Design an enzyme around this catalytic site. Sequence first.
Site, PDB file in Angstrom:
ATOM      1  N   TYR A 508       0.963  -1.300  -0.021  1.00  0.00           N
ATOM      2  CA  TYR A 508      -0.215  -0.447   0.096  1.00  0.00           C
ATOM      3  C   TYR A 508       0.460   1.139   0.158  1.00  0.00           C
ATOM      4  CZ  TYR A 508      -4.202   2.611   0.884  1.00  0.00           C
ATOM      5  OH  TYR A 508      -4.659   4.126   1.036  1.00  0.00           O
ATOM      6  N   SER A 591      -5.922   1.184  -4.919  1.00  0.00           N
ATOM      7  CA  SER A 591      -5.494   2.115  -4.692  1.00  0.00           C
ATOM      8  C   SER A 591      -4.175   2.773  -4.719  1.00  0.00           C
ATOM      9  CB  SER A 591      -7.035   2.142  -3.429  1.00  0.00           C
ATOM     10  OG  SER A 591      -7.030   3.881  -2.635  1.00  0.00           O
ATOM     11  N   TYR A 592      -4.055   3.523  -3.522  1.00  0.00           N
ATOM     12  CA  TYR A 592      -2.596   3.637  -3.696  1.00  0.00           C
ATOM     13  C   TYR A 592      -1.742   2.750  -3.413  1.00  0.00           C
ATOM     14  CZ  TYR A 592       1.028   7.403  -2.864  1.00  0.00           C
ATOM     15  OH  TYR A 592       2.343   8.469  -2.397  1.00  0.00           O
ATOM     16  N   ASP A 669     -15.995   4.098 -10.680  1.00  0.00           N
ATOM     17  CA  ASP A 669     -15.230   4.381  -9.188  1.00  0.00           C
ATOM     18  C   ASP A 669     -14.965   5.637  -9.140  1.00  0.00           C
ATOM     19  OD1 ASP A 669     -11.829   3.447  -8.539  1.00  0.00           O
ATOM     20  OD2 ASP A 669     -13.009   3.984  -7.323  1.00  0.00           O
ATOM     21  N   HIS A 701     -15.047   1.633  -6.119  1.00  0.00           N
ATOM     22  CA  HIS A 701     -14.079   1.880  -5.535  1.00  0.00           C
ATOM     23  C   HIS A 701     -13.223   0.195  -4.613  1.00  0.00           C
ATOM     24  CE1 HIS A 701      -9.614   2.979  -5.097  1.00  0.00           C
ATOM     25  NE2 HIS A 701      -9.399   3.121  -4.281  1.00  0.00           N
TER      26      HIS A 701
HETATM   27  C1  LIG Z   1      -5.482   7.071  -4.198  1.00  0.00           C
HETATM   28  C2  LIG Z   1      -6.218   6.948  -2.814  1.00  0.00           C
HETATM   29  C3  LIG Z   1      -7.142   6.087  -3.221  1.00  0.00           C
HETATM   30  C4  LIG Z   1      -8.186   6.042  -1.556  1.00  0.00           C
HETATM   31  C5  LIG Z   1      -7.295   6.389  -0.481  1.00  0.00           C
HETATM   32  C6  LIG Z   1      -8.500   5.518   1.028  1.00  0.00           C
HETATM   33  C7  LIG Z   1      -8.902   6.716   1.771  1.00  0.00           C
HETATM   34  C8  LIG Z   1      -7.736   7.825   1.677  1.00  0.00           C
HETATM   35  N1  LIG Z   1      -8.865   9.135   0.102  1.00  0.00           N
HETATM   36  C9  LIG Z   1      -9.030   6.793   3.031  1.00  0.00           C
HETATM   37  C10 LIG Z   1      -9.344   8.488   3.671  1.00  0.00           C
HETATM   38  C11 LIG Z   1      -8.116   8.098   5.323  1.00  0.00           C
HETATM   39  C12 LIG Z   1      -9.233   8.982   6.247  1.00  0.00           C
HETATM   40  C13 LIG Z   1      -7.874   6.899   5.578  1.00  0.00           C
HETATM   41  N2  LIG Z   1      -9.581   5.722   3.297  1.00  0.00           N
HETATM   42  C14 LIG Z   1      -8.929   4.907   2.064  1.00  0.00           C
HETATM   43  C15 LIG Z   1      -9.399   3.337   3.352  1.00  0.00           C
HETATM   44  C16 LIG Z   1      -9.025   4.620   1.379  1.00  0.00           C
HETATM   45  C17 LIG Z   1      -8.223   3.675   0.477  1.00  0.00           C
HETATM   46  O1  LIG Z   1      -9.129   3.679  -0.718  1.00  0.00           O
HETATM   47  O2  LIG Z   1      -6.722   3.336   0.163  1.00  0.00           O
HETATM   48  C18 LIG Z   1      -6.295   6.882  -0.217  1.00  0.00           C
HETATM   49  C19 LIG Z   1      -5.489   7.561  -1.986  1.00  0.00           C
END
Ligand SMILES: Cc1ccc(-c2c(CN)c(CC(C)C)nc(C)c2C(=O)O)cc1
Lengths: 727, 74
Positions: A508, A591-592, A669, A701
């Site tokens: 991740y 995702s990331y 998505d 997503h």
């Molecule tokens: C490119 C991307 C896409 C999504 C996220 C993500 C985020 C941020 N949008 C958050 C909100 C945070 C408060 C943790 N949760 C999660 C579970 C995810 C994830 O699905 O991994 C981070 C980067």
Amino acid sequence: RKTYTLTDYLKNTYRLKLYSLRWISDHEYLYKQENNILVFNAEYGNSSVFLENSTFDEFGHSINDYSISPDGQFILLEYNYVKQWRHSYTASYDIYDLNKRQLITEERIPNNTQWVTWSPVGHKLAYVWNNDIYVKIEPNLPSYRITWTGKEDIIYNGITDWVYEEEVFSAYSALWWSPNGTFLAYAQFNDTEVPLIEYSFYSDESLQYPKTVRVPYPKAGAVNPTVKFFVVNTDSLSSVTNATSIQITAPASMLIGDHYLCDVTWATQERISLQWLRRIQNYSVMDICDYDESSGRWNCLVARQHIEMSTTGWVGRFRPSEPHFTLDGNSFYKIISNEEGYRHICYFQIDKKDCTFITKGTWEVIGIEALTSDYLYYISNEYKGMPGGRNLYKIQLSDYTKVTCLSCELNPERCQYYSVSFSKEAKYYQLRCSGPGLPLYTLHSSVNDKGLRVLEDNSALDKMLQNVQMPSKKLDFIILNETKFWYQMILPPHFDKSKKYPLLLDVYAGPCSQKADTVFRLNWATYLASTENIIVASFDGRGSGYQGDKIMHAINRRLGTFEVEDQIEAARQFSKMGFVDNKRIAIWGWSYGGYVTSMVLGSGSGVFKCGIAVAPVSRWEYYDSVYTERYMGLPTPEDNLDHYRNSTVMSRAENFKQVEYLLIHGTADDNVHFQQSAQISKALVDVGVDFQAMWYTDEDHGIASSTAHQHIYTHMSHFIKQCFSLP
Amino acid sequence: SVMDICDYDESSGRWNCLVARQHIEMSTTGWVGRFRPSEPHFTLDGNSFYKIISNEEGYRHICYFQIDKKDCTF
Ligand SMILES: Cc1ccc(-c2c(CN)c(CC(C)C)nc(C)c2C(=O)O)cc1
Ligand SMILES: *[C@@H]1O[C@H](CO)[C@@H](O[C@@H]2O[C@H](CO)[C@@H](O)[C@H](O)[C@H]2NC(C)=O)[C@H](O)[C@H]1NC(C)=O
Ligand SMILES: *[C@@H]1O[C@H](CO)[C@@H](O)[C@H](O)[C@H]1NC(C)=O
Ligand SMILES: *[C@@H]1O[C@H](CO)[C@@H](O)[C@H](O)[C@H]1NC(C)=O
């Protein structure tokens, strides 16, 4: 003789039991034993009946969720659930007089309601319908309409818009009752000039023309939603004269332009705290506001202001930390980055600005969990210096040196990752232990820290896992450039290190992430180790959290650099350990993690033979402003455009000629847009590299449909087996 | 006519005219000011000012403004 198979994972053959409870008071709680609801006690020990499925059988609709009024006179039933984004959804609701179990037949709550909540005491109801806020003082009486400006996809009263939902509040509601239920604080969002992301939605095969979904969504740099904050007095709500909401404005230093509301927290019946974050998220402000009785107004003094800033990165983990207030309201504790990067608890005088740290050292407090007049309870990763462990610490407010670990020594070998749930005045508490052993749920008296009873111990699941050849879990660290970097490994049963195993790197690597911990899991990785004899590995490199700002802020303004490098170096280090097959190392992430996998496959390092990217970011300009800007800045010539352009996966296309690539993305998505992957495939087409691909019609997503979830994991299995030549 | 009062933001380097501190001057019988709106004279701490404006009788007089209130006093 048998292993944890792909079907076991997809059909949930071996289930983890939970003890999800919810406290109704300080003595009792509720539990779903069978599917009939029971009341429970910890005081003398006993536990009687309270509700069932046949209280609301001839109801008709299946109940998605319920909610008891704090007083216990009313129950709110939630049905007709229609999911929207990650937290947002819409639903239909019915109230019963819980005393008589008869439905409140008239003045019912409207269909398609977007959020609903009880006051913290009594039985007041606040709900949002068509983006406007309503209040029901007595469930059978008519509502009072608070706002009149709600307009779809434009003005949101009491609920968040897309980006406040995903990134700021992690919630749909933007409503906050005062402790005694007199005041209803709320936020209003304006997405008027915010551009729409548009994409096709195909629907059931009956839909002759596809539908185009249009969501206000600020990508990096675009025009953002503006915000306003209000409070209204829910007692003097008339019936002949529209409610008047008092506006609390942002401090001056915020109004200079582009800022966010990122925390809302009440202190007393007449004192509320707000936190504002500049759009450049390295400067945040907290305003404390008192209700002026002979005015009907809210006054926030300039002296009472406190300032959280960061010279080396952004402020917070993902946001400024919430404050916990002592009963008088004149004092509060909140976790901040300490003098030398580590996050610890600071003690605040409301009036003066010099706070003082009540904890220190090379570890981080994760969250402040409970506050009494006596002690303060919190969770942290200090025990054995393990970033990926969690335990419950209790600190004596009269003497800060006298701290006690309440969870550390309980079950050392089984239990290194705890969360807690307190009763309404902290006389009792539940401990969730999520691993490394089988999860264990145990109820305690806090008054004497004695363990009362084992609630759920997963001895049922323990029982069948002895018939199964289960994978082992190694947690350890490696020293890079005189720094401790943690990793975890899911190792095949009967693991012998004179063999060369194929290794999948599970990644991740996002800002403040942690993939290396003590949590027990049953997942895709469990199957790969158990059946396919694959090692699944994760690694927390520069940019990962819970180990000090030094490590976490290490990629500030610099996404796609050190977290990409460090995953490659992780593999090298694992291969250098001598039990990995060098010719068979794969990389995958979602995702990331999709973005990083892709950058790693694009890096030309030659370590990885193949890899899977699922819903990846392809360049940071495509992703939402709040999340992206925090780490990247603005993509403009005078800020950080150069790096935006230097950090796209498209620019690295040529290098995919060295690897087998599987790119997967859901076409609906809302979060990481299909676009991002469309640009990946086009880049790769244009340089002439072959690759596997898969879209998922109408998945978001999560790719979380039953059938799609099964389909993707089956598809990815085939890809990895084949890449690894597994028979 | 609209008077803006703008402060310097130390940390950014930019100037901020708070909409709360704006002051409006207008006429429903003619133009505003004698040949233009009047100039303000600020107190040493710049939190308040004095200004010649037309009173409710049509007569120009020295009005005393605080920086945060709509209404002055003559
Ligand atoms: C490119 C991307 C896409 C999504 C996220 C993500 C985020 C941020 N949008 C958050 C909100 C945070 C408060 C943790 N949760 C999660 C579970 C995810 C994830 O699905 O991994 C981070 C980067
Ligand atoms: C939401 O913000 C928009 C501006 O982005 C506001 O729209 C302006 O409203 C004024 C006053 O009615 C108009 O004269 C302007 O022409 C509008 N501009 C635009 C771009 O639409 C809108 O009023 C705001 N709504 C709320 C309730 O705050
Ligand atoms: C919700 O919608 C249905 C179907 O149109 C209707 O029969 C029902 O009465 C509605 N309920 C409420 C709470 O208005
Ligand atoms: C309250 O204000 C709204 C919108 O500004 C208006 O339409 C309405 O007449 C008022 N409602 C009542 C019940 O007086």
